[PDB]
Amino acid sequence: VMHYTDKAALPADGEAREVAALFDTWNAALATGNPHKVADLYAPDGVLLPTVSNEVRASREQIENYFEMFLTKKPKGVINYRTVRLLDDDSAVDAGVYTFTLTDKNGKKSDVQARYTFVYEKRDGKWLIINHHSSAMPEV
């Protein structure tokens, strides 16, 4: 069984770096505890297939609803394994493995490792999430 235990460094230089850094901005949005700030990073037509809900989210209001629940866990993410694939100047895929540190209602911390896909599209100069698929490690 594969486990991913280290932390993926940024490509220190270049345009893979730009795409890769977007996760940092997203992680920071989580830390605000504000679902609207997180939702702001998704395209109005983005699609979220999330870690802990069977409901696929395909509207801003659906996405906000997920984060309204998810953010109560004070989630903090770290990338363990990264691939970046640039499609054109204005679209890219960042996919791999990441780990959330979550806090339960009693303050107890646990880690959940998950695979991720972020598909981004640059619109009017801003990169927005078009697809986010996040899933627990299937072998546990």
Binding site for a second copy (CB under 8 A): 1-3, 45, 47, 49-56, 58, 81, 83, 85, 87-88, 90-91, 93, 95-97, 115-117, 119, 121, 130-131, 133, 135-139
Residue 42: CB atoms within 10 Å: 22
Sheet holding 42-49, edge to edge: 42-49, 126-136, 109-123, 91-103, 76-88
Minimum CB distance to a second copy, residue 131 (Å): 5
CB of 55 to a second copy, least distance (A): 4
Using CA atoms, how far apart are residues 41 and 110, in angstroms rounded to an integer? 26
Minimum CB distance to a second copy smaller for 31 or for 52: 52
Cβ distance to a second copy smaller for residue 71 or 116: 116
Work out how close the CB of 37 gets to a second copy at its nearest, in angstroms, rounded to a whole number: 23
Determine which helix (DSSP H) or strand (DSSP E) holds 109, and give its type and residue range: strand 109-123
Find where tokens 């998810």 sit.
70
Nearer to a second copy, 45 or 104 (CB): 45
* 1 three-state secondary structure: coil
CB of 58 to a second copy, least distance (A): 6
Name which of 32 and 44 has its Cβ closer to a second copy. Answer: 44
The upper half-sphere exposure of residue 64, i.e. CA atoms within 13 Å in the direction of its Cβ, equals 8
